[PDB]
Design a protein around this nucleic acid. Structure first.
Lengths: 207, 82, 100, 153
RNA sequence: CUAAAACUCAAAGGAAUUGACGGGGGCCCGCACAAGCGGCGGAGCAUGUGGAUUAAUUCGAUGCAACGCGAAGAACCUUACCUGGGUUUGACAUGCACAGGACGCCGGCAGAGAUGUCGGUUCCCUUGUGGCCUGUGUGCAGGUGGUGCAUGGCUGUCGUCAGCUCGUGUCGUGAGAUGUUGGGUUAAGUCCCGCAACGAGCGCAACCCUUGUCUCAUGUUGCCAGCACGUUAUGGUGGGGACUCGUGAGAGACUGCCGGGGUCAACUCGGAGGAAGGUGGGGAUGACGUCAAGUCAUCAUGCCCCUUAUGUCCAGGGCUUCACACAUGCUACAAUGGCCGGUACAAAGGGCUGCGAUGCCGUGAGGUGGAGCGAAUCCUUUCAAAGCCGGUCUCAGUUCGGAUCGGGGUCUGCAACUCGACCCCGUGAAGUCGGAGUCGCUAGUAAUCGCAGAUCAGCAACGCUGCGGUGAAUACGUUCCCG
């Protein structure tokens, strides 16, 4: 182990918590239903890239804010998808739970979405080098994106020997606290196993 | 040892066994699995087939061995030497 | 660990709440005062008749998801392996690495 | 000490005698940080010596030091891939340190039933030139003399 | 001197490049050595491992970097091992079906228990059926079964060492080379000057935490200096920001200034100031990679294997066995001490079905009891021990040492036999400072003393992680040893 997770390194300075509620006696069950909601929303939706999931709790009422790059796929025109997610969220003992489906402004400056796309391409038949080149070149076009590093590990290309490869463009100072580093990790499922993809993206610094 | 307030711990199974055994003043071989049961002066004549781990060892109670537990007289590990 | 053993731990907990709440506690209250007539009461013998799983002495703090029986932390209900991984990801509010 | 000599600690003077040497002695006899007990031992030894001889502790202590102070020693030196016992001149600070250490160590092996009495007897014998520390100084000077041939390097 | 053959090999060779190595050289570092202090190796005990044993002594870990390790808590459970007793769409999930109103509970009996049986209780939808389970099934579950030489993830180590690379250019047929070498300097591939190189990236440093000084803000549960009431029992009480303290903001060290060395360059020596002077002290942070390092037993996982069992339930036992060996620690061998009496100073942390006081009962573990506290308030006593004062012991296998053993008890737990801790009485072993050899430590350090926490019903805790009390010696210098 060499590098700690960038989100946890700047959790108290730059980034913000993905769950927002206060609990003293009911911390454990709140955590239980939080992780249940997270796994339910991760398993239910896989076509549209789920960027993020926030949960807010005040007594009975829960607000689950889910971000995706394709809101139309995860929502129903008559509310069918909305009805499904609502019904499966009531069943998680969430009492009164309401969902805010939202859309990301730039779906290529998000490290999680970039890793999602890279894994999806690498899964079926795409050579990995093409995946990293396309992802990096597409990331540089965005205005605020100033650096990007993409690294994949595993049996790349179905080989018998595991390998690690990484390509960088710009500045990625993982040691700098004020600089924000969007970090995204995802595991692509190939017939020869599992390939890990990590993406770091630098868009300016906050003070 | 067990506290004096709680009283001696004797399992109910072999308890009712020994009350039904001594009511007619006949002492047949009683087979038991509860090594943890202590020895009561009501066991003075009875002989127990106390479990060991492989088989049951016969133990004939006397006045001297009261207050101990059955498991004392059923040695578990068998060591003869190197 | 093993699914059967993760389940059996929970079954002990529901047994404990059902029995140890009053049955396996009133007998202890009987045995506490030497003044209380325990010997003829057979509160010892009556409490032996209860299932062993009633006793909390048979419980085991396992990891709430992982099932890990050792290296447990009561504040989080999580294994040392899992606490390290979720604290690093900023999942436990108000937890961070130390320096002093 | 690869990058140069290290600074020295400037130990303070004593309250009841006002000399550096007695403070050095109490620091030498110090064990486990029990400075009060070491000071008690040293002060009692000095008072015992004063009562026995009738003169001031410090003068006879200095006489004992000068009696047991060495001037030549022997060190193992490797020249040309070969080791020899070379006699070496001793700096005054090292001589004082060695003399005090020898005094304390040899007084610890005496048979006078108490540290204070053993130390008093040892310092008196060293003042008169009869202590075992004097014998150790004689032996180390003899060993330095015996290896004088190796003094040229 | 001339000079074969059978047979056998798929090569033998020449030059040069990158590493690695040298009992080759040069320049440097590190408690590496040298100077010291305390130990281990000798004894008793605690713990782990090897071996042996056993029905089983579950499994993994083997120099640094395994061996008070996974295990931050093995009587049962844990548990994965053994004996025996049950069970199979299974201990637990979800889907396709047939029948239903019960599943579910609560008491009795038999059994070591699992379990079997007996007795009382019985669904709400709404006519289509849904929730429960029954059996019948059928997909399927379930494996701490194998392969860390198929893997992900996580971690150790070289090593917090200063190094590892790339773009373009240039040289060479090519592997490759330069940049990264040379002089100087630094803790540093840190920087300066040169230079077929010009730049860049990951490394170094800085940004973060704590700590040392001060300013502003700040007064409760925290202080009390000046004022009143206090009753001994004290900030205890009214009151007060003055001094601490608590926690917010800020200042403060930047070679900033001076003198001298220095290519007037990096950098270096000394001095003033300041609380702190030259990365102030300690942390968090561990580059490319190495060792097919460790982990299919945190978890996930490709492939193989079991599936009336290698799954699953229960009782008992085992992981605690002992002719030995190795390792890590604790207690000692005593007078720098043992015992008795008095007496003064900490920090940090924990507490709700928990901390638990006063009082009372025991000699003592402890029992009764419950004040007050989710806690700067109450409890852990007001907190300590080493320390200081007084008395006694008088160099002895002892008033040292406590092992071992006999008897009697307390607490937890359904249960202290195998196999808990503690308390009381008696018992009183080895041990006289420990061979070859070997380890830790440069200052609030070694040494020594006590306190707290996690795990935890109880503890094997002398272990681990923190906190403070008292607090040394030495470093001449890189020849030898290791990296």
């Amino acid at each position: 182990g060499q590098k700690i997770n960038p989100h946890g390194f700047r959790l108290g300075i730059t980034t913000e918590w993905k769950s927002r509620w206060y609990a003293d006696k009911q911390y454990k069950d709140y955590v239980k239903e939080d992780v249940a909601i997270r796994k339910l929303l991760a398993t239910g939706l896989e076509r549209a890239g789920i960027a993020d999931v926030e949960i807010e709790r005040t007594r009975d009422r829960v607000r689950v804010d889910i971000h995706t790059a394709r809101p139309g796929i995860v929502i129903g025109r008559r509310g069918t998808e909305a009805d499904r997610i609502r019904a499966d969220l009531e069943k998680l003992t969430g009492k009164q739970v309401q969902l805010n489906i939202l859309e990301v402004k730039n779906p290529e400056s998000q490290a999680q979405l970039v890793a999602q796309g890279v894994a999806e391409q690498l899964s079926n038949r795409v050579a990995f080098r093409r995946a990293m080149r396309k992802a990096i070149q597409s990331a540089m076009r965005q205005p605020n994106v100033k650096g990007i590093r993409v690294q994949c590990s595993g049996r790349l290309g179905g080989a018998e020997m595991s390998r690690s490869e990484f390509y960088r463009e710009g500045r990625v100072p993982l040691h700098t606290l004020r600089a924000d580093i969007d970090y995204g990790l995802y595991e692509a499922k190939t017939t020869f196993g599992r390939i890990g993809v990590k993406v770091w993206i630098y868009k300016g610094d906050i003070v | 040892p067990r506290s004096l307030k709680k009283g001696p711990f004797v399992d109910d199974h072999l308890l009712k066994k020994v009350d039904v055994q001594n009511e007619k003043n006949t002492k047949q071989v009683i087979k038991t699995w509860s090594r943890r049961s202590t020895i009561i002066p009501d066991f003075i004549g009875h002989t127990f087939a106390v479990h060991d781990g492989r088989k049951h060892v016969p133990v004939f109670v006397t006045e001297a061995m009261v207050g101990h537990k059955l498991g004392e007289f059923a040695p578990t590990r068998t060591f003869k030497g190197h | 660990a093993k699914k059967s053993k993760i389940v059996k731990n929970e079954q002990r907990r529901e047994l404990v709440q059902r029995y140890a709440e009053r049955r396996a506690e009133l007998k202890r209250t009987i045995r506490d005062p030497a003044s209380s007539p325990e010997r003829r009461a057979a509160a010892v013998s009556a409490l032996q008749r209860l299932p062993r799983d009633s006793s909390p002495v048979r419980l085991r703090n396992r990891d709430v998801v992982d099932g890990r029986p050792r290296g447990h932390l009561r504040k989080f209900g999580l294994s040392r392996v899992r606490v390290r991984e979720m604290a690093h990801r900023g999942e436990l509010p108000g937890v961070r690495k130390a320096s002093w | 000490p690869r990058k140069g000599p290290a600074p020295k600690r400037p130990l303070v003077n004593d309250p009841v005698y006002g000399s550096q040497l007695v403070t050095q002695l109490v620091n030498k006899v110090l064990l486990e940080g029990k400075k009060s007990l070491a000071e008690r031992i040293v002060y009692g030894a000095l008072e015992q010596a004063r009562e026995k001889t009738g003169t001031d502790p410090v003068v006879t202590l200095k006489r004992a030091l000068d009696n047991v102070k060495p001037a030549l020693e022997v060190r193992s030196r490797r020249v040309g891939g070969a080791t020899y016992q070379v006699p070496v001149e001793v700096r005054p600070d090292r001589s004082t340190t060695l003399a005090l250490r020898w005094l304390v160590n040899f007084s610890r092996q005496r048979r006078e039933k108490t540290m204070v009495e053993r130390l008093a007897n040892e310092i008196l014998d060293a003042s008169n030139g009869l202590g075992a520390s004097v014998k150790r100084r004689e032996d180390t000077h003899k060993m330095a003399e015996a290896n004088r041939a190796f003094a040229h390097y």
